[PDB]
Amino acid sequence: YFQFYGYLSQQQNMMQDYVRTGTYQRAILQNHTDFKDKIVLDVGCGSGILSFFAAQAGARKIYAVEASTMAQHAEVLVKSNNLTDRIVVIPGKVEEVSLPEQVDIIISEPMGYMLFNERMLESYLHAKKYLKPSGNMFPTIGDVHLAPFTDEQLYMEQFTKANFWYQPSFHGVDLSALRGAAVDEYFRQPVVDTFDIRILMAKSVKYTVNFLEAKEGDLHRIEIPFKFHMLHSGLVHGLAFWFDVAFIGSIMTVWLSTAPTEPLTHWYQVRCLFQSPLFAKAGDTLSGTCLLIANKRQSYDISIVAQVDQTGSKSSNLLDLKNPFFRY
Amino acid sequence: YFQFYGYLSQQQNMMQDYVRTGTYQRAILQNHTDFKDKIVLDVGCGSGILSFFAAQAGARKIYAVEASTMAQHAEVLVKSNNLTDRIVVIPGKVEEVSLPEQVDIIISEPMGYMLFNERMLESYLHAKKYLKPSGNMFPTIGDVHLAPFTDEQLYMEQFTKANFWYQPSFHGVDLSALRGAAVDEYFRQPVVDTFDIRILMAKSVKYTVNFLEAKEGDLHRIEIPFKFHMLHSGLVHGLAFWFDVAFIGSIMTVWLSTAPTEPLTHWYQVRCLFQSPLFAKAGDTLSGTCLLIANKRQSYDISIVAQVDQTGSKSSNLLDLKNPFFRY
Numbered sequence: 286y287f288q289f290y291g292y293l294s295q296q297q298n299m300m301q302d303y304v305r306t307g308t309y310q311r312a313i314l315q316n317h318t319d320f321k322d323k324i325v326l327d328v329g330c331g332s333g334i335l336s337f338f339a340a341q342a343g344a345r346k347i348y349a350v351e352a353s354t355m356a357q358h359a360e361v362l363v364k365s366n367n368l369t370d371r372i373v374v375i376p377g378k379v380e381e382v383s384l385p386e387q388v389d390i391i392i393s394e395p396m397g398y399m400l401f402n403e404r405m406l407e408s409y410l411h412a413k414k415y416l417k418p419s420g421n422m423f424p425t426i427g428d429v430h431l432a433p434f435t436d437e438q439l440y441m442e443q444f445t446k447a448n449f450w451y452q453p454s455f456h457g458v459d460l461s462a463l464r465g466a467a468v469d470e471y472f473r474q475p476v477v478d479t480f481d482i483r484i485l486m487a488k489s490v491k492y493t494v495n496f497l498e499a500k501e502g503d504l505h506r507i508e509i510p511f512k513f514h515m516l517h518s519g520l521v522h523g524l525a526f527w528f529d530v531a532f533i534g535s536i537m538t539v540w541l542s543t544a545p546t547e548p549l550t551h552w553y554q555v556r557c558l559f560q561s562p563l564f565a566k567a568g569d570t571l572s573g574t575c576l577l578i579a580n581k582r583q584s585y586d587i588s589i590v591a592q593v594d595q596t597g598s599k600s601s602n603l604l605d606l607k608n609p610f611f612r613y
Numbered sequence: 614y615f616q617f618y619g620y621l622s623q624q625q626n627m628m629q630d631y632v633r634t635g636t637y638q639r640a641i642l643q644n645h646t647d648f649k650d651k652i653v654l655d656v657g658c659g660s661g662i663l664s665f666f667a668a669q670a671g672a673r674k675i676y677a678v679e680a681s682t683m684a685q686h687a688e689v690l691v692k693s694n695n696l697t698d699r700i701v702v703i704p705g706k707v708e709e710v711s712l713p714e715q716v717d718i719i720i721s722e723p724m725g726y727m728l729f730n731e732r733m734l735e736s737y738l739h740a741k742k743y744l745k746p747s748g749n750m751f752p753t754i755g756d757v758h759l760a761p762f763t764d765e766q767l768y769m770e771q772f773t774k775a776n777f778w779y780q781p782s783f784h785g786v787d788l789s790a791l792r793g794a795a796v797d798e799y800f801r802q803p804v805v806d807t808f809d810i811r812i813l814m815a816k817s818v819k820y821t822v823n824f825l826e827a828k829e830g831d832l833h834r835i836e837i838p839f840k841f842h843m844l845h846s847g848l849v850h851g852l853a854f855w856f857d858v859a860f861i862g863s864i865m866t867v868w869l870s871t872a873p874t875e876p877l878t879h880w881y882q883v884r885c886l887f888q889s890p891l892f893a894k895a896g897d898t899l900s901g902t903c904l905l906i907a908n909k910r911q912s913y914d915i916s917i918v919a920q921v922d923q924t925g926s927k928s929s930n931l932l933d934l935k936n937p938f939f940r941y
C-alpha cells in the first residue's frame with residue numbers, strides 16, 4: 286500500500302478515469318466559494334491533483350500529505366506549476382505528521398472497491414483532528430448500495446473453473462478429492478466487473494456513512510442489515526455492491542456514482558456469490574445481514590447471510606476482499 | 614509468498630504448463646532406479662505432485678515440506694491416493710521443521726523468473742543439511758543465459774506509455790515536468806514475455822549454478838560478467854535472460870529449458886532495457902557485468918553495465934525484479 290502507490294503508472298491509470306477526475310474538479314470548482322482564501326488538507330494526495338484543484342478555486346494554503354515516494358513527484362509538480370508558497374507537500378502518514386494550523390476543509394479520494402477496501406477511509410476520518418468546527422469534508426457522505434442478482438452464467442463459471450480438479454489420472458495422480466475445495470475457493474472471491482441492471486431482482490438497500498460525524502473505529506466492524514422486496518421470480522445467486530459519494534458544498538451538492546446505471550469507472554461494481562442460490566418469487570422478502578470485518582491485510586472479511594422469509598430457505602458465504610476476481 | 618501459494622487456482626495455473634509438469638515426470642521416472650526404495654525430500658511441495666512422481670518411481674518414504682495452507686490440500690491428496698504410509702506432509706518452512714532421517718534425494722521446483730526471482734533456491738540449498746553424501750538433487754544444476762537484443766518497438770513503447778505526462782493542461786495542471794521520471798520508471802521494469810530469436814545480436818553467455826555444491830549465501834550477490842561477439846550491426850536496446858535446469862540422473866540427464874528456441878513456458882523470458890541503446894558493428898565486442906543483489910522483498914535488484922570496447926560508448930540500468938512488466 287506504501288510502495289504500489291509510489292508508481293506514476295498507477296497515478297496515470299487512476300487519473301485516466303474521466304468520471305473520477307472530472308467529478309472531483311467539478312465538485313471543488315462549482316463550490317469554489319468554499320475554498321476561496323481557505324486552509325485545506327489533502328489526505329493521501331498522490332500526484333497532488335486535488336491540491337491543484339483547491340489552488341484553482343483560490344485556496345490560501347493547502348497541506349498535501351502523502352505517505353509514499355509519490356510525495357517527491359508531487360513536490361516536483363508544485364515547483365513546476367509555480368505554487369510552492371500555496372501547496373505544502375508533507376511526506377508521511379497523516380497519523381504521524383504535524384500541521385502548523387487547523388484547516389477549513391479536508392479533501393481526499395479514499396474510496397476502494399465496495400468503498401471500504403484499502404481502509405483509507407480510516408485515515409480520512411483520522412484527519413478530522415485537524416478540522417475546525419466550521420469545517421467541511423469533500424467528499425462529505427458515502428452511500429453503499431446492495432441488491433440481489435440472478436446470474437446463472439457467473440455461478441456456473443465457478444464450477445467450470447474447478448473442473449481441472451476432476452482428473453482421476455493427472456500424470457497418474459487422482460486430483461478429484463480437491464475439486465470441492467477449489468469450487469469453494471472460487472466462491473470466496475468477490476467478482477469485480479460491471480453487469481447490466483436487468484440482473485437485479487429487487488431495489489437496492491442504502492447504507493450511509495456521514496464522514497463529518499463517523500469515527501475511525503466505526504469501520505472496524507460494519508453491519509448492514511437488509512430486507513429486499515423481490516420484484517422478479519427466480520434464483521438469487523448473490524448480492525451486488527456499489528457506492529456513491531456526495532460533495533455537499535455551500536453552492537451545490539455533486540455526486541460521484543459507481544452505480545451500474547451510470548458510466549463505468551475503474552471501481553466497476555462488486556458481486557459476492559452465495560455458496561448456493563436461493564429460489565424467490567416476486568412478492569417474497571429476502572432478508573439478512575452483510576457484515577464487513579476489517580483485517581490486518583488493510584482489507585475486509587465479508588460475511589453475507591440471506592433467507593427468503595416465506596420458505597425459510599437460507600444461504601451464506603464468507604468472502605475475502607483481499608483476493609478479488611477481476612472478471613472485466 | 615506464504616499466502617499467494619495457498620491458492621489452488623495458482624497450483625492449477627502452474628500444473629497446466631505442460632512442459633513443466635511433463636519434464637519433471639520424465640526426469641524422475643526415466644531415472645526411477647534413483648528413487649526405488651529411497652528416502653526423498655520434496656521442498657515446497659505445493660499440491661504434492663513431485664511427491665507422487667517420487668512414489669510412482671518406487672520411493673520408500675517421501676517428506677513433503679510446504680510452508681503455506683496448500684499443505685492441508687496436499688494431505689487430502691495423499692489420503693485420497695492411498696499413500697499416507699509413504700508420503701509424509703510436513704506443514705512449515707524447510708528451515709524450521711524436523712525430519713526424523715537424512716535423505717537420498719531432494720526434489721523441488723524452486724525456479725522464479727530469471728531463475729532467481731522469489732529466492733526459493735535459498736530454501737532448496739538450505740535443505741542440503743538433510744542430504745546424505747551419497748545424495749542427488751533434482752534439479753541438479755541451473756544455467757542462466759544472457760544475450761543482447763535489438764528491439765526498437767519495445768524501446769519506443771516505454772516513451773509512448775509516458776506521453777500522458779506531456780500534458781501542459783490536464784484539467785489546468787501542467788504534468789510535463791514528471792515525463793522524464795515516468796519514462797525512467799518504465800525502463801526500470803524487467804519485461805516478461807517471449808520474443809523471436811531474430812532479435813538476438815550475439816550468442817548467449819552461460820552462468821552455471823551447481824546446486825550439489827552452491828551454498829545459500831552465494832545467491833545474496835550474483836555477479837555475471839559477459840563479453841559478447843556481435844554478429845549483427847545495429848542498436849542494442851538491452852539484455853535478454855532465460856534459464857535451463859538439468860536433472861542429472863544415473864540413467865539419463867533431462868533438461869527443462871525456458872529458451873526462446875524451445876516451446877513457451879509460463880516462465881516466458883525476461884528483457885532488461887538499457888536507459889539508452891548502444892550502436893555496435895558486427896565484429897565489435899560488448900562487455901560488462903550483470904549484478905543481482907537479493908532484497909528484503911524476496912526479489913533482486915538487477916544492475917546492468919555494458920560498453921562496446923571499440924567505441925567506449927557505455928550504458929547501464931538498475932531494474933527491480935519485484936515490479937515486472939508482463940507484456941505477453
Ligand SMILES: N=C(NCCCN(CCNC(=O)NCc1ccccc1)C[C@H]1O[C@@H](n2cnc3c(N)ncnc32)[C@H](O)[C@@H]1O)Nc1cccc(Br)c1
Pocket residue numbers: 286287290291296298299300302305306309328329330331332333334335350351352353355377378379380393394395396397398403405408550551552
Ligand atoms: N483505490 C482508490 N483509492 C484509494 C486511495 C488511493 N490513494 C489516493 C491517491 N490520491 C490521488 O490519486 N489523488 C489525485 C486525484 C484524486 C481524485 C481525482 C483525480 C486525482 C491513497 C493515497 O494515500 C496514500 N496513503 C496511504 N495511507 C496513507 C496515510 N495513512 N497517510 C497518508 N497518505 C497515505 C497512498 O500512498 C496513496 O497515494 N481509488 C481507486 C481504486 C480503484 C479504481 C479507481 Br479509478 C480508483
Ligand SMILES: N=C(NCCCN(CCNC(=O)NCc1ccccc1)C[C@H]1O[C@@H](n2cnc3c(N)ncnc32)[C@H](O)[C@@H]1O)Nc1cccc(Br)c1
Pocket residue numbers: 614615618619624626627628630633634637656657658659660661662663678679680681683705706707708721722723724725726731733736878879880
Ligand atoms: N514460480 C515458480 N516457482 C517458484 C516456487 C513456487 N513454489 C513451488 C510449488 N511446488 C509445486 O508446485 N510443486 C508441484 C509441481 C512441481 C513441478 C511440476 C509439476 C508440479 C514454491 C512453494 O514453496 C513454498 N514455500 C515457500 N517458502 C518455503 C520454505 N522456506 N519452506 C517450505 N515451503 C516453502 C510455497 O508455499 C510454494 O508452495 N514456478 C513458476 C513461476 C512462474 C511460472 C511458472 Br509455470 C512456474
